[PDB]
Amino acid sequence: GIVEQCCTSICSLYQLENYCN
Amino acid sequence: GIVEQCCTSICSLYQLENYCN
Amino acid sequence: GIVEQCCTSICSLYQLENYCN
Amino acid sequence: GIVEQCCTSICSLYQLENYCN
Amino acid sequence: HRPFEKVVNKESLVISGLRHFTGYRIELQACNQDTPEERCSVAAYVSARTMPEAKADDIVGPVTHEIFENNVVHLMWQEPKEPNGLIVLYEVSYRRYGDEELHLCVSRKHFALERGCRLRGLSPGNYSVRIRATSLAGNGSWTEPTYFYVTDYLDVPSNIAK
Amino acid sequence: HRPFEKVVNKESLVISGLRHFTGYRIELQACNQDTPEERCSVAAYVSARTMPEAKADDIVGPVTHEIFENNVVHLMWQEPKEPNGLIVLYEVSYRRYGDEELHLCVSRKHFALERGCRLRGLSPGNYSVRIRATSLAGNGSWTEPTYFYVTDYLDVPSNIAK
Amino acid sequence: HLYPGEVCPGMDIRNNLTRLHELENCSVIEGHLQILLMFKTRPEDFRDLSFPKLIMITDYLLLFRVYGLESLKDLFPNLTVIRGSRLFFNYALVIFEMVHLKELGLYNLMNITRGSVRIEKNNELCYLATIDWSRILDSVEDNYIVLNKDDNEECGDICPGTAKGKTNCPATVINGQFVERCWTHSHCQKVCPTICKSHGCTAEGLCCHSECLGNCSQPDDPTKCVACRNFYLDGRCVETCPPPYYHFQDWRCVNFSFCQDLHHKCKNSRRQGCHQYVIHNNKCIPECPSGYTMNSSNLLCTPCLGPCPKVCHLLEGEKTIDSVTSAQELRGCTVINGSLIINIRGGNNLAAELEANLGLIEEISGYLKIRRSYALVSLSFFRKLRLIRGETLEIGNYSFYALDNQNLRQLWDWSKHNLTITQGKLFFHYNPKLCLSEIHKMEEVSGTKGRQERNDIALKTNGDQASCENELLKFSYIRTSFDKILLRWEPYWPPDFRDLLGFMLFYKEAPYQNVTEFDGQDACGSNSWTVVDIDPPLRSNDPKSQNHPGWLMRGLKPWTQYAIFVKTLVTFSDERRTYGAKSDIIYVQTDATNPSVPLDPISVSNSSSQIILKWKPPSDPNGNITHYLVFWERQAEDSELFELDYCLKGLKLPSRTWSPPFESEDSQKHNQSEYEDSAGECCSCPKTDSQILKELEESSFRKTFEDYLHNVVFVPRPS
Amino acid sequence: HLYPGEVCPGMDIRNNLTRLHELENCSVIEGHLQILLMFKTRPEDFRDLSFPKLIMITDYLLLFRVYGLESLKDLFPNLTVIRGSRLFFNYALVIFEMVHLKELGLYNLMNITRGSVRIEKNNELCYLATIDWSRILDSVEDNYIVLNKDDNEECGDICPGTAKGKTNCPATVINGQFVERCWTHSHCQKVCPTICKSHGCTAEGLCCHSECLGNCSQPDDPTKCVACRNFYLDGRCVETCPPPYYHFQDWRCVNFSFCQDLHHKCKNSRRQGCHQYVIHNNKCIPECPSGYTMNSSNLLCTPCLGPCPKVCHLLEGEKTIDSVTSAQELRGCTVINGSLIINIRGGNNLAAELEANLGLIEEISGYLKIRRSYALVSLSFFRKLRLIRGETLEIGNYSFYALDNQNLRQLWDWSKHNLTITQGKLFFHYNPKLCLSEIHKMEEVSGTKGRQERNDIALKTNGDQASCENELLKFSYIRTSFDKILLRWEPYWPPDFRDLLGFMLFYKEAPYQNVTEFDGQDACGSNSWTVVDIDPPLRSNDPKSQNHPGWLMRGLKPWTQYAIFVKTLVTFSDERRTYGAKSDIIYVQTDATNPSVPLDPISVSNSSSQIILKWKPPSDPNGNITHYLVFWERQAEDSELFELDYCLKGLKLPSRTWSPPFESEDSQKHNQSEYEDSAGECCSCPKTDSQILKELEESSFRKTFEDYLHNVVFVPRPS
Amino acid sequence: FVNQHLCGSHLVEALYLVCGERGFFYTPKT
Amino acid sequence: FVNQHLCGSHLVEALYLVCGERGFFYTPKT
Amino acid sequence: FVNQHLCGSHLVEALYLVCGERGFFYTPKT
Amino acid sequence: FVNQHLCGSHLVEALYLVCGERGFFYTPKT
């Protein structure tokens, strides 16, 4: 979950590379 | 304290049950 | 002791017999 | 409407920060 | 012994049957309570005098006089009883050289004092008046500024107040 | 500008070199940064009159008169340099044998009009001088209504000047 | 012919607009529709490409953060009304953080069915406070429409006040006066007769067919309307659907072939439906209620053998009920293979739909939990609940981990419920309007107080407001006056009189007896709560008591229904104690006096022998006024007249002549704030604090002294 | 000699006055006596005997439940002081539960050593505004006198002395009125100066030697003393025991033979509860210190090279610590084979004594406990405490249990306070003034904080009315005026900036420039720090906000320093993520200003040309006043004066001393133009007059909606 | 009372009324 | 003893009127 | 204040003290 | 991207500037 992933823990790039172009 | 005790400071009823007659 | 016996309950007479001669 | 904002109603510090350039 | 007048679920009243030119001091109180007995508040004293009209400002009675080679006039006039504000009053004073100046006031105290006020000096000669024109409502008789030769109430170069 | 003054951390200050019992005023401000401007507030305003001195109302220069040939006394002097505020009034009751005895209720303006007071035609016999000058104190040229004996149209010296 | 164009499922688009070319010119949608998150966008491309062939939708419509647009009538000029079936977060219309707009401009709505809206954080958009939802919505309070350029006090009204067609804007009446509503600077609102609009209303203002709705072309026919009420069929709006066609989705009615080919398909490789739609109660629905199953014979929810409950087994590790959508995800079911939570929020009072969706689950495998619901007041929706099993538990092996319900006045009516607990440790804190009485009763009907333990309850909390009670006091005697009130009531003497600390007198005004308990508002002073502490009385336990508790007044107003009650100053201990003692909320009239003249003694006349007067009552009500009285009187002309003349040096005037001109105030320009604070009532009013903590500790000091004394001085000597 | 009596130790006066045959000829005291338990008595029994042979006391004396017994001056006149070697629950003398107690005597007392007296519930007593205790105690903070006939507010107390017969009457004002300091209506009190107060005044001469005390039969004679500060031997007060003699219990010396047989009487075949006295420190004391024991017959203690711990197996498997009595019962114990409990009371500190008593102790075999210690502040007196080992726990495996401590705010500096709470839990509720970070340090030094669990520690408490914090605020710019002031400071963004809701500011006047470093006691407000909040700024710039926070204070007195500081206002946390943050305070002047008006002028003269002008300062003197500008002229000549005061007109009508117009004319514009602006000035308006509860809910609700949106849309795919 | 007091006729009324018919010591300014 | 609760003066009067005037005897404990 | 209205050239001096060195104007009601 | 914790509009804008064009999606196809 984004806010669980990001608004509590830090969301690095590799934590986010799934859904970019 | 029939008058002065109540008009020198705070008063109370237990004061006043005895100034009864 | 004392209050544990009688400041808790309506204790018995025997707890005052305990404080007898 | 700083005047209508604050002389006819309530205002704020930011509310007049904008009328400031 | 005093007026007793009552109002019923209102906030205004118009009392009537009133003398006029009367500033009435009003004691004012009220009672929610009537069955055991009334419990009425203090008297907020308040007053007002009635709206005046052209009712008695003008003079009640006839303005009259006398004529005398005694050099005197016993002047008279009737003053209204319900007076309208400032009573009209006509001051008079003449002058001749050598101890022959004259006078007549209209004022409530002077009327009460000198029975009006009494002229002294009526005889032929040069007799004139200063007239500060005064009438709060106008009248049928003023001092009527001219030069008033001592003949009688005659043509405007003579005594005139009517 | 206006006469100036400053203070050296007092709570009190005075003035002198000033006309006796004469009307001035106050403007006490509060300067806090005097150098770019006298940074002193609006003031706490108040007036003043203190310590009258009847000596000035009394004739600093005595007052003789003119013996007019019409049997009249015209009152002549030169008013003070400090007349003790303002010269107010005299008691000039005059009336007899008719109505021309020349009463004068005299201000600055009236004395300027007349340069004094011009009495009636003289009267050999007793004569009261109840004439008095009036500053705000009230002493003037007063002795009493002491009935001076006119001596064949003369000798009415109101010269005590108390 | 009312919904001619074909229907296309729900979908969203979040990129280039070519995904809007997917349509072969639809009319109405099934399923959710949203379009949001497009930056590289600009209002000119939206001038064209409006889709007016649309008619209606049912599910929620959401728009969010698409950069570049001015208004809506160049998008959806024909989009009738939104139903509510699956709201998003208890809301239907969500136009949120939409930038660049200037006015809404949407005229097709006239009566939205259910749900609510939020149109918020719009730093460009105006023309919403000139739009009336009162005549279109029923849940007109749950809607948060805020933080817009209408809210930030910038925009103006240029809505047509002269009929460009044949109407000025309607003087629609909300917010007090008539609000000269509009959607745009051009369009004006539509008003309709009250009952008639509920089944549509003409362009003129006439009623229409009962199954017509909203806009109607021909008044009083079922086929030339624009909207329907319940269903339709093949051209007309209806109330039913006889066979072979059967109800479907609360807006239409279909064929056996329709439902048939529905169940022949699924999300994936299953040509028999995973949510296979089937017939029952003449409705073509996806799955049966409890007590029914099916063999694939003719598409009817067949009655079954024994029960047939609904194990709505959740793939999650936990479930939240914070929205109605959660309820819909658990509507109709009756059983859990997991746990459950309530997390209601906001001043909404959602228990209605909850009891509509739920109030039918009565089996739980795991654990319950309730939190942080400022508007929640009861669990009355749980009118079926039987069991909270132990298959999983919260921290420390807990099951009913209740907490933080800042307005929960009470739980169910503990008179008709039968229920089970099997495992489970409890947990209760910050329940400031939950009564310890019903809590203990919940322990009694728990079926568990062997496993109940210490530290679970915070008796220092959980009922600190809105006094609950188990004991009572009474005014054994009362005697009063117009300004004073002497009260004498029965005593309380707990297991230790020493624990007593005094009494409170709650007292305050009230115009009628409609007033009620007031304990659980803000516990500070300014609550209309004038209160006072008084010391408790001498005991004289050895004789029979002849000195009851009492108190007497410092101030009152006459003829006042002063509501009054009390409460005891009590010492706390770690004991399942009584609440203490109170008395009921008695309402008491006060005796009589008028010492107050009424204000405004007018002074004027209206004729020569007539007068004119004004009275205005004191703020002292002084009984019910019954009549006034006056003692007027005359003044002869004083020596004020007989001390002057006016033939004199100059002239003066004691003013015999009329001069009450009825002046007024030009200096007293009291502007909109009609209030001042030259002085006041009690500035930083005296209201006690931890300054009384000292006295509490002093009484405890007294207790401890007597305790140590009475302990070591006496001693048993049997042995 | 001065001290001739026979050794007469403690005894209970109870249920029969015949026990004064134990006072057949006595004059000495040891331990205590107990005057109580006489219900069938009256003045005959207390005039049947009166035994004035006494000398003094050491520990205390007692009074309880005996009728009559008018006073003591007849009973025990020769009675000097109490040593306070023991106490009765933090008091050294009792006055309690007496009926028909007219007065007391005790006109022979000069220095009460330790503790205090206790007066209570003797409702027939007065003449106690003539009796100081600081002049009879070397320390007065804990004394406590209450509930007598004086608490009815009568007894004007005509005491003699300088009045009613000169009798060497030292009156001594202490508060604002001298008083004939005495004890009765027919006695007096003895005042000393510090020249000889240490060891006592005497009107016999003027002082005694400085090893006497209290009184002395001869002035300036070191053997004719009456009291001894330090010691005693052979007819004279001294200050040391010469070393063939040895010291026993603060009141004497004896020879080695005396101490050894005063033991060895009990060193025989009968246990009479006696004790193991041994010579040590030149002192015949009860037992051996640590690293000192005695298993021999050399009659002196001797150091075991190993540790000789002062193990003391508790009774009851526990003990409460409630008083200095319970404390002294363990001084000279270090290890506790038991479990202690600390339940202290009263507005009195005791860390001084406990650091003398408990300030050696190192090892509790079981657990600590803390309970409603009101006036306590610290574990400071626990300065050797290391090991609360895991062998005993309260209900729920607790190794530590603290609660209701309304003033605890810091334990230690953690320099090298190396402890181990080896096993077991914690418990913390209603522990407000103690920070959380300190508790976290306690869990750190503890070991496995993993032993902790949910709700083992509170988070809604413990730092409420003030607190330390982790991060600090700072400033960027300030600007000021004479009537207005600006502050603009740094912006703060928590990791979830939504969690923040604004800044909380505080300020005040402060001519005294060392004001509190306090957060704020906003308990129903109730603290005159005029506080107002502020909406937070935007997230406009993503790296760093170009808009700094700000709120403008205004309406302040000119040339007035002002303390100003602020602090966060944050959503109630869920884990130990942040303590908010704060700013320090700044004494800030207010700029100079032109318009202040001086008050109360004067205008009268001593002479005509003279005028005395005098005045006062303003209400706003505006700092350093340079000087007082002045103007005046002959502004006295209007046109209102040459045309007045004719003959029959008024004589002195324009006699205008203090002329009308220049004076400050009356006014009625209370607040119209620029003060109706400031019309939210108010009274009984709280300092927290805002239902932030609703606002907290609104913020949480918005967060819920946005989180729902984003966490739905974010990843509907694995890529 | 709190800062105000039991003077005037409030005093005498409440003084009679605290007992009613027992009687009281009449205390105008005792 | 008494059905009421025995705290304080309660307890003192109780022990009084239960004593029979012989009391509780402290044997020398040390 | 902001609790209630705010008028006069208090506004003017406020804007002067606040804005300062980034330029300020006003709708002159003065 | 910031190595601070991302939330709200900051998160939205940062995420767009991260992925940008033809990267990020709602997928009802799943």
Author numbering:
A (entry chain E), B (entry chain I), C (entry chain G), D (entry chain K): 1 to 21
E (entry chain B), F (entry chain D): 756 to 917
G (entry chain A), H (entry chain C): 1 to 719
I (entry chain J), J (entry chain H), K (entry chain L), L (entry chain F): 1 to 30
Article excerpt on this structure:
Here, by applying single-particle EM and atomistic molecular dynamics (MD) simulations, we report the structure of the complete, pseudosymmetric human IR-ECD in a T-like conformation saturated by four insulins. After further classification steps, 3D refinement, and map sharpening, the 3D reconstruction of the ligand-saturated IR-ECD reached an apparent overall resolution of 4.3 Å, as estimated by the Fourier shell correlation (FSC) of independently refined half-maps (0.143 criterion; Rosenthal and Henderson, 2003). While two of the observed insulin binding sites agree with those mapped in the “head” region, the additional two insulin molecules are located in the now fully resolved “stalk” regions, providing unambiguous structural evidence for the existence and mechanism of site 2 binding. If anything, it is slightly inferior for the head-bound ligands. These additional insulin molecules were analogously named insulin 2 and 2′, as they employ their site 2 residues to interact with β-sheets and interstrand loops (Tyr477–Trp489 and Asp535–Arg554) of the FnIII-1 and FnIII-1′ domain, respectively. Insulins 1 and 1′ were in the receptor-bound “open” conformation with a detached B-chain C terminus (including the aromatic triplet Phe B24, Phe B25, and Tyr B26) that is critical for engaging receptor site 1. In contrast, insulins 2 and 2′ have a “closed” conformation, which corresponds to the conformation in solution before IR binding. Stalk insulins 2/2′ mainly pack against β-strands of FnIII-1/1′ domains, which provide a stable interface for binding. The asymmetry between the two IR-ECD protomers is clearly reflected in the final reconstruction of the saturated state and manifests itself in the built model as described in detail below where appropriate. We observe that the membrane-proximal fibronectin domains converge, highlighting the coupling of ligand binding and fibronectin domain interactions as intrinsic features of the IR-ECD. Under these conditions, site 2–bound insulins may assume yet another function by acting as a molecular wedge to prevent L1 from folding back onto FnIII-1/2′, thus stabilizing the T-shaped conformation.
The insulin receptor (IR) signaling system is a key regulator of metabolism and cellular growth. The IR is an extensively glycosylated disulfide-linked (αβ)2 homodimer with a modular domain structure. Each protomer consists of an extracellular ligand-binding α subunit and the membrane-spanning β subunit, which also harbors the intracellular kinase domain. Insulin binding to the ECD concomitantly elevates the receptor’s intrinsic tyrosine kinase activity before cellular signal transduction.
